[PDB]
Structures are given as structure tokens and as C-alpha cells.
Amino acid sequence: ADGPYSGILDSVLDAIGNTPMVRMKRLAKVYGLECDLLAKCEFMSAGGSVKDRIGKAMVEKAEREGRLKAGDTLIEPTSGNTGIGLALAAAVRGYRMIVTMPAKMSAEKSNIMKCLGAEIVRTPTEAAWNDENSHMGVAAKLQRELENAHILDQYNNTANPMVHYDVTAEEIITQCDGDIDMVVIGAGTGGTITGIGRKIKERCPKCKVVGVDPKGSILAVPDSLNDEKRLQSYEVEGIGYDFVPGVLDRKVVDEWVKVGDAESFTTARAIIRNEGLFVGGSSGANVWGALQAARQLKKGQKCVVLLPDSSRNYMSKFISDEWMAEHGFAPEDGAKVKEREKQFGGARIRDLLSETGATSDVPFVTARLSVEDVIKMMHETKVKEVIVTEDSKLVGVLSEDHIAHSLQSGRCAMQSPVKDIAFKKLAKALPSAYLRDVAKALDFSPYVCVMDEECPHFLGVITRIDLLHWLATKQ
Amino acid sequence: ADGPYSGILDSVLDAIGNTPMVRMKRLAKVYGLECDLLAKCEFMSAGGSVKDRIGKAMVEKAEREGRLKAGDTLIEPTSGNTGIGLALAAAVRGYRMIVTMPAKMSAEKSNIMKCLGAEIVRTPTEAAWNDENSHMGVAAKLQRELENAHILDQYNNTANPMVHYDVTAEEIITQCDGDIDMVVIGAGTGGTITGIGRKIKERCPKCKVVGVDPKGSILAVPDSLNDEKRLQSYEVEGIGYDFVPGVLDRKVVDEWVKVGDAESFTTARAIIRNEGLFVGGSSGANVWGALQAARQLKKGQKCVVLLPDSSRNYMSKFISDEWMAEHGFAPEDGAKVKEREKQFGGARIRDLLSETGATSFVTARLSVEDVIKMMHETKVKEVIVTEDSLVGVLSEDHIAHSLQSGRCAMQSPVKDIAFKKLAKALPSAYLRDVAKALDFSPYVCVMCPHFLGVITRIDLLHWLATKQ
Ligand SMILES: C=C(NCc1c(COP(=O)(O)O)cnc(C)c1O)C(=O)O
Ligand SMILES: C=C(NCc1c(COP(=O)(O)O)cnc(C)c1O)C(=O)O
Numbered sequence A: 001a002d003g004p005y006s007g008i009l010d011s012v013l014d015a016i017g018n019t020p021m022v023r024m025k026r027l028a029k030v031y032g033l034e035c036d037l038l039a040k041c042e043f044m045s046a047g048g049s050v051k052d053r054i055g056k057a058m059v060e061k062a063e064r065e066g067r068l069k070a071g072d073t074l075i076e077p078t079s080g081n082t083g084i085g086l087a088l089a090a091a092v093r094g095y096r097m098i099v100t101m102p103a104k105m106s107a108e109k110s111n112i113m114k115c116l117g118a119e120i121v122r123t124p125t126e127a128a129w130n131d132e133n134s135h136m137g138v139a140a141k142l143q144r145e146l147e148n149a150h151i152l153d154q155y156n157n158t159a160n161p162m163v164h165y166d167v168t169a170e171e172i173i174t175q176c177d178g179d180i181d182m183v184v185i186g187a188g189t190g191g192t193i194t195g196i197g198r199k200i201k202e203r204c205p206k207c208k209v210v211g212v213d214p215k216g217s218i219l220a221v222p223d224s225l226n227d228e229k230r231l232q233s234y235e236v237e238g239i240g241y242d243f244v245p246g247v248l249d250r251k252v253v254d255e256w257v258k259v260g261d262a263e264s265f266t267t268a269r270a271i272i273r274n275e276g277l278f279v280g281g282s283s284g285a286n287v288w289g290a291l292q293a294a295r296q297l298k299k300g301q302k303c304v305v306l307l308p309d310s311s312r313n314y315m316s317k318f319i320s321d322e323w324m325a326e327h328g329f330a331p332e333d334g335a336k337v338k339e340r341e342k343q344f345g346g347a348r349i350r351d352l353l354s355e356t357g358a359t360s361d362v363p364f365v366t367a368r369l370s371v372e373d374v375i376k377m378m379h380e381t382k383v384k385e386v387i388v389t390e391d392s393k394l395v396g397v398l399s400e401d402h403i404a405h406s407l408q409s410g411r412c413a414m415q416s417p418v419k420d421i422a423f424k425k426l427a428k429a430l431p432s433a434y435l436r437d438v439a440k441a442l443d444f445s446p447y448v449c450v451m452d453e454e455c456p457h458f459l460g461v462i463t464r465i466d467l468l469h470w471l472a473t474k475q
Numbered sequence B: 001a002d003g004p005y006s007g008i009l010d011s012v013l014d015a016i017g018n019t020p021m022v023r024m025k026r027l028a029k030v031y032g033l034e035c036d037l038l039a040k041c042e043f044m045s046a047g048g049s050v051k052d053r054i055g056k057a058m059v060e061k062a063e064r065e066g067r068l069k070a071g072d073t074l075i076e077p078t079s080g081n082t083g084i085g086l087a088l089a090a091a092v093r094g095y096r097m098i099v100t101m102p103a104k105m106s107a108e109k110s111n112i113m114k115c116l117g118a119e120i121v122r123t124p125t126e127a128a129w130n131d132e133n134s135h136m137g138v139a140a141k142l143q144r145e146l147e148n149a150h151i152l153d154q155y156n157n158t159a160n161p162m163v164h165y166d167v168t169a170e171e172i173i174t175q176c177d178g179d180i181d182m183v184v185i186g187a188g189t190g191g192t193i194t195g196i197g198r199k200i201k202e203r204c205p206k207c208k209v210v211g212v213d214p215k216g217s218i219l220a221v222p223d224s225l226n227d228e229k230r231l232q233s234y235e236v237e238g239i240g241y242d243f244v245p246g247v248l249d250r251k252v253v254d255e256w257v258k259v260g261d262a263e264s265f266t267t268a269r270a271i272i273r274n275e276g277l278f279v280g281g282s283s284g285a286n287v288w289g290a291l292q293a294a295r296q297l298k299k300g301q302k303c304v305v306l307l308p309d310s311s312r313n314y315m316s317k318f319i320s321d322e323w324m325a326e327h328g329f330a331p332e333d334g335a336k337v338k339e340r341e342k343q344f345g346g347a348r349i350r351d352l353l354s355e356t357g358a359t360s361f362v363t364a365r366l367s368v369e370d371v372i373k374m375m376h377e378t379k380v381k382e383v384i385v386t387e388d389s390l391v392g393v394l395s396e397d398h399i400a401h402s403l404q405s406g407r408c409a410m411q412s413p414v415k416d417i418a419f420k421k422l423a424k425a426l427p428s429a430y431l432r433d434v435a436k437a438l439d440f441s442p443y444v445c446v447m448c449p450h451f452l453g454v455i456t457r458i459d460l461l462h463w464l465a466t467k468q
Helices: A025-031 A051-064 A081-093 A107-115 A135-145 A159-176 A191-203 A261-274 A281-296 A321-326 A336-344 A349-356 A371-381 A400-408 A435-442 A464-472 B025-031 B051-064 B081-093 B107-115 B135-145 B159-176 B191-203 B261-274 B281-296 B321-326 B336-344 B349-356 B368-378 B396-404 B431-438 B457-466
Strands: A021-023 A036-040 A073-077 A096-102 A119-123 A149-151 A182-186 A208-214 A255-259 A302-306 A385-388 A396-399 A426-428 A447-449 B021-023 B036-040 B073-077 B096-102 B118-123 B149-151 B182-186 B208-214 B255-259 B302-306 B382-385 B392-395
Touching: A021 A159, A025 A036, A025 A261, A036 A159, A036 A281, A051 A081, A051 A159, A073 A081, A073 A135, A081 A096, A081 A107, A096 A107, A096 A135, A107 A119, A107 B261, A119 A135, A119 B431, A119 B457, A135 A149, A135 B457, A159 A191, A159 A302, A182 A191, A182 A281, A191 A208, A208 A281, A255 A281, A261 A281, A261 B107, A281 A302, A321 A336, A336 A435, A349 A435, A349 A464, A371 A385, A371 A400, A396 A400, A396 A447, A426 A435, A435 A447, A435 A464, A464 B135, B021 B159, B025 B036, B025 B261, B036 B281, B051 B081, B051 B159, B073 B081, B073 B135, B081 B096, B081 B107, B081 B118, B096 B107, B096 B135, B107 B118, B118 B135, B135 B149, B159 B191, B159 B302, B182 B191, B182 B281, B191 B208, B208 B281, B255 B281, B261 B281, B281 B302, B321 B336, B336 B431, B336 B457, B349 B431, B349 B457, B368 B382, B368 B396, B392 B396, B431 B457
Parallel strands: A036 A302, A073 A096, A073 A149, A096 A119, A182 A208, A182 A302, A208 A255, A426 A447, B036 B302, B073 B096, B073 B149, B096 B118, B182 B208, B182 B302, B208 B255
Antiparallel strands: A021 A036, A385 A396, B021 B036, B382 B392
């Protein structure tokens, strides 16, 4: 039915949480996991992360104890999501926000927290927590140097674990109807894992609690697990630290799984591809840890894994295949890059032009020709498409269909220059280019022209239908 | 309580819809609107857009009539989301996806549907619908040339308006408790506006229905409203077309408001800043139309506006202030760019260096022993290591802490412990640009390599304290 949202909400803070739980049947079938892999889609909150909860939570406590008045300044060290939640809470309830986050974190978090009118100071990535230039040390410095400023310190604020203990874990319990055998949580500040594990062990002691920390962090026990990449920087954001946070109660968790960047990102992309959850990299790390931990489980029992934040915070970072290739990470078993490598192989556009047969030079027009002259030339030459010149780059292509339809639509005058009706989005290529790169370029441009700018002697235009015909010529 | 999600969900398709309605009290107070401006946060769906609904809906219909079997190919022209929704439905229920979208649409939509294993064909932006190179014409061509391919044709499929008439409008009715005075909807395919307006007028005929169309489309009535920028391309994606779709029943809507790109984007940024809803540009267009239409309303009555999709699809496009300045769009009334322009003004780093009095190098391969000796003998705290063909900065605090942390041996080269993220500046640069650059780099170094020092945000705050 409609219980939580059947009414009107006073602000966006009332729309955080209440995230649904989805069964990842397809992903489990892909990785061959017999038990039921449940996913807590915390990334569908208002701010798109679990930390939104704690943000609101801390503010509520700060307002319930009278320690916060309107117009004050709020300071918080964060990896980006807790800053987002506190920025939402401040923009709603009238507080000033200043965030301290390392330069390792994505630019989307910085831009969206700027959209909430929050000042953002970046800290060096390689800095240790003891340094005065760390996000926490710099936040303390800012609190010392600013009037009416406050740090809620999610690393030490009891609201962070207490609310995951109060509402989030209760949500997981009500959705799983009490039957939970394993729960896998990423280890960042440690509040989410501490709270949820404590509540579930209280209401279901048979449930195992597994924590995920990236190779480079020191949050796993024993220290034999951290020796892989001791204190080595990683690309995944949100989990792992060079110190044990005050809220992290490592005694509530049973197992620890170390996950690297490559596995985390490949599993996040597999999540997006097979399940359809627009989720972030830390969730890929958590899901890889869950897949490695619950392999010994059998059918019927449920292993619950949390997906902290959405792909929105890493839109340019790891959804783009170019950046995932720059870091040498396997995209996925079934992906478009691998599909195009398998289908096309070492085929170049020269092979396609030879198999079809160009043996021709497409017509040419000076890009300022009148529509009368270009229509006369097109009717006398019998060709359909034409390419307009440059004057100094290339302008584009034009077909008789657009000519007629724009002339009759009142958008192309007969005395108008041909540049006004040409297609302006194009991609330059060369006969030596492979089919995979031109296929990737077709993802962003409708046409692809060859050998632009010896001499500018283009051979033809290339679209996706040509690639489909080339695939049809094979078996 | 917990009614719709208190249980387990079989797939992501069960997470579409059920979006909450929020009262934009702060935005109304900013723009001086007396009535209650309610916002339907359809961007909070699983796929982050309203079109997800119709996507699922069409697939359900295609499966309810047996017209769809496993392994088939699905083709659909879309501005971006209806492709995302159908890609989700196909990846879940085992269908192949091929999308046709104009090059005008953002790259985030294409990348997100590529992550869903969907083929993406781009079409020219200026092409008309009758052209064979339009997304709809090219989709028809693909249907002709591909085996087992299907187009559900959201422009003509009755599922698109029928489901907004069945569940979405019923949702808004149940949350608003029937009392709705005005409904403001963007005009894209026109299915959502038709469905929602028809259902609400059936269950509340006194409610006025106003449609929002961008300056450039011809969907408004009368045609005197489209004459501003006739058939000229605009930057907002999702709303407006050069033809009336088959599902669009223009007779159900009363008013029409034309909105430009600048107003739409500035209002979307104002939505994000004042309310905290990560929404797209079409939502800004709809909200500007609502602010222009419901101005005559009074306290107590409610004007509901749809927020189609989230900022996720335009992260690089219009959330970035650089692109908003490249297109000459006013950022916002209260924004970080305007705040720094007001606080800093035309101040450059020369003025800060003169007011503070900073009168004022390592080859990046000296051993830690020698650098500690130099640091103790020179009494300075920070040092900057040079280049060989710039490497970064290093302080004694990080030196000591990395020595004790087991990461920096005394015989190790200093490059291993230096800070690698840096930003280059020059004394002529203003304070606003270095403040914007500090959003991405912790330090900022000036300018032969004869730099005088490093400047961070605390220095800018001290400079602001030295003024006023
Ligand atoms: C420490 C912070 N992030 C926690 C986090 C985590 C870890 O969640 P914890 O509540 O810290 O246990 C996992 N994934 C992402 C994307 C995260 O951002 C923060 O936002 O300040
Ligand atoms: C053409 C399309 N426009 C829908 C749309 C709309 C208009 O919603 P309609 O259901 O098309 O009436 C508003 N905002 C955005 C971001 C949209 O994508 C589409 O979704 O395929």
C-alpha cells in the first residue's frame, strides 16, 4: 500500500531512508551463488547515500539538546556523502556548511555540495590522520578559527551508529522478516556496520556479520589481512581509514574481507549491468566481499549486503569506460567494450570500405552556397548526401530529406546559406582506425567522417548502420 | 509506517514509482509565492526519472498481450530516460536494447544506458521528425532491418498515458487528499501530462491544468506562444518537440507557459540550493512555469509540479558552473560564484601577498635524512620539491607521522612522501578563480620557476578577515 509517503512531506529531510530491499537473483546466477543475495538499496535516499541518515540524525540530536541555533556554521570531515547529508540538512534548516574532504574523492561530490552553498576545502590525499592538514585536523582548525562553528564528528558522534541501530537495522529486520543469516557492510566510519550488526545480533544472534575494508586500510582483524597493500592509497571512496574510528566496534563483526579496487569496480559495473541498480563503487566492494564470504552458504538462507551510495557521485569517474581502462581494470565479463572487441576484432574501417566498395568521392560544397545552387547540384549529380567545406574546421553533412523538410517547415529559406541547415555534430576518423574506437565514437556522434585534413580527401561517412551491415557480412 | 517496501522486492522494476511529494516552502519564500508549491519527486524512482514508469508499463503490456518473448530486441527513440527505463526492464527480463537518441542529449544518459548493455545510436540534433535520420525514423529503419526487433513507440503507445492516469495521478491524488488547485507538467511525449490531468480533472474538475513547453517547440496553444524562437534548438532536454505526439491530448490542458533555457537552468539550480532536491533541467523549467502560472493563487491552495528526472543525468552538463558560464546563464541569486564575486571582487593574489607580507626548493630525490636536517636547520615548516624535466609539497608533520607509521624510510626518496595533487597559479590571477580552483586541489602554487609560496583556503579566510 502507501504508508510512509501517503502524505505531504515538510522537507527533503523527511524523504531520506525507507529504502527498499531487492533480491539480486540475476547477479547471483551470474556469479553462481546459491543463497538469496539481498541488497539494501540505501543509494535511493534523497541525497543518494546511507550517510544522509546520520547527517539528519546528528542534526536532530544537536537540535534536541539545544546545542544548535539558526545561522550557525557547520563543519564536518567527510569522504563526500556525510557532507551531502549535512548540506541538505543545513540548506533546509538554515545552517551554514563548510566541508573538508580529501582530493582523492570525486569531483561530482564537490560540485553537488557546492550547489548546496557549502564551502569546500580540499586536503592532500596521502596525508595521515595525525597531520594538521588532514580533513579532520583541518576541520578542527576551522572550528578553532571560526565563530559559532560546530563539528558533529561522525567519527565520534553516537548518532551515526545509534540511528543505524534504531531505524536502518530495524528496516532490514522488517524486510527480511527476521530471517537473516549473513550481513555484509562496508567499513568506513564503522557506524553503519556497528549499529546494524549490533541490532541484528540482538534480534537474531545466528546472523553472521562480515565487514569489508579495501586493501590499504587497517580496519580488518587480524593484521595479517592488511599486509597485502599496507597503507597504500586506493581509488574506492567511502570505506577504509588509517585509524580505528571511535564509533567502530570491531567486536560486533565476525569476519573481515579485503577487496581491491579492480574487483570493487568490476563488481559495481556487474551490479549495474545485470541487476540494474545505479550504484557506486563502495557497493561493488561490499558485493564482492559478500560473494567471497557467503559462498559456503546454501539455498534459502539470506545474505544482506548494503549499497551505500549511487553512481551519481562517480558519474565521470568509473561509469566511463575510458577512466576504467586508464587504470587497467577489467570492465566486466559481458560489456559493450568486450562485445565490440569480440565482434569487430582487429577490423579497421579500411576493411569495411573495401568490402562494401567506395570507389568514389562524395560531392562537395563551399558551406555558403545558396539552397538553389546546392539543390541544382544535388539533382544534377543524383547523390543524396553532401559534405560542406571549412574556411580556416569541418562544418558537417546534409541530406536531401532535411533539405526538403526544413524548406517546407519554414526553417530553411531558399536564399539562406547552406551552413544554416548542415549537421554540426561530427567525429573525425582515419582509415587506420579500428572498428571498436569508431563504434565508441558513434555513441556520442551521429556521423563519422574519414581522413579529415596529404590533403583533406575524405572517403565517406560512417554510421552505426554501416557497422551492422559489416557484422551482417560475417557469421 | 511501512506499507509498500516493508517486504522483499523481486527486482528493480518493483522499485519504480511510489515517489514522495515534498512542500517547497523555502523556494516559495524565495520567489514570494503565497500558495503551497508541492513537488512530485519522480526523480527518486529506481532509474531516477518518471519515464521509468512507462518503460516498465509498456513492457508489461507487451508481455500481457504475448507480443514479447525472451531474447527479443527492443528499440525505442527517446531523449534519454525512456531509454534508461526500457534498458532496466530489458536487463532484468532478458531483452536486448537498442536506443536512438539525438546528439543534443547529455553523455551521462548514453553512458548509463551503455552500462545497462544497450546499443546507442545518435541522431543529428537539428533533424526534423520526418527525416530518415531522426531518432524515430532511424528506429523504424532498425525495426525494418533487424530480426525479432520491436518498437514500443512511447510517442504512440497507450501505456505511456494510461499508467500516469492509473498510478501516478492516483498517487498524487491520495497524497494531496483530493485538494488540488493547479497542476504544472512538462510537455515531452505528452503522455504524463495527459494522464495526470485527465485523472485529476475526473476526480477534481475544479483543478486547473497548465502545461510547460520550452521556447522552440510547437506544442503550446495558441501558436502565438511559439513565435518567440520558432523551431530553434534549446539546451533543456526531455520536453518539447517539433510535432504533436499521438498521446498528447492538448485539449485536457488549460494554460501553456513558454520557458527558455536560462530561466529553466537558474530555477533548477535554485531548487537544488534552496530545497535540496537533486533534479534535472526540465524540472527547473516546470518549476519556473509553475511560479509564473500559480502567482495568482493564495494561501492554502496547493499547486503541484512534476520534477521529471534527477541531476544524475546532467552531472557534467549543468551542475558544473563552467558550462553554465560558457552558455551565459545566470547561476542563481544566492550561489557560490556570486558569493565569491561579492566577497573577493577584483582582488588578486598580489594584494594578499602584499597585505600579509610573504617576502620568501628541493630536487625531489633527496633522502629523508637530508631533508629533515635542512628542515631543522632552516626553521621552516613546509617545503616544495621541484621538477626534473613539479612534484609537490611536504611538511615536517607528515614527515614525522609517516616515519612513525611505517611508510617513509629515512633512505627513501622524498618524492614518495610529497603531495601529488597541486594547482598552478600566477600573481595576476584573481581571488575568485583561485577559490574555485581550491575546490579541487588542496594547495595552489604560484607561477622561470620562481614561485614565492603556497596559498590555501585558510589564507583566503584570513584575507576576508582583513577586509570589512
Ligand atoms: C565516511 C564516509 N563515508 C562512509 C561510506 C561507507 C562506509 O559507511 P560507514 O557508515 O562509515 O560505516 C561506504 N560507502 C560509502 C560511499 C561511504 O561514503 C563519509 O561520508 O563521511
Ligand atoms: C521525450 C521524453 N521526454 C520526457 C521528459 C519530460 C516530459 O515528460 P513526458 O512524459 O514526455 O510528458 C520532462 N522531463 C524529462 C527529463 C523528460 O525526459 C522521454 O522521456 O522520452
